[PDB]
Amino acid sequence: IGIRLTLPPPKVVDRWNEKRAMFGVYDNIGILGNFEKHPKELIRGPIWLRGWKGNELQRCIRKRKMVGSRMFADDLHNLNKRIRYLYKHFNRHGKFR
Amino acid sequence: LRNRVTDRYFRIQEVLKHARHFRGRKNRCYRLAVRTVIRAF
């Protein structure tokens, strides 16, 4: 009974809207623009993970380091607890050692 | 619930179809029908 009895409303996707049409443009800004701008500078998102990647523990550490002072009280407490738990898990648990 | 199973009905039916001719709840309840059908096969 976890199956709907009617077809869901048709999902129409405009493959040629502006976003999809111009997606990927300026990805080669560096190599095609005398390397004035690195492609990572085209990344819009959280300040602490612009042009950067890492596991959950590294991401949490970076977030606390970069915006920890601007975080809300309970959010920062949660981040500290998450960093503590991730440290314990990654440094004391796992199949391989 | 990013990813959820939507075929569970058909997954259950694939066994209930072979269990339809059993007796009792073995022909209706998957938890029982699957065991009975495995034994039958």
């Binding site: 976890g2 199956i3 709907r4 009895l5 009617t6 077809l7 869901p8 999902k11 | 619930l1 959820r4 939507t6 075929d7 009905y9 058909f10």
Partner: peptide, 26 residues
């Protein structure tokens, strides 16, 4: 509601089959 279309389509086909079996056409 579970997002998706293919399971719903399969169930619609099965419902059509059951409807035909219950009320076979002339």
């Amino acid at each position: 509601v579970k997002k998706g279309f293919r399971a719903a389509f399969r169930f619609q086909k099965e419902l059509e089959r059951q409807r035909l079996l219950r009320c076979p056409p002339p």
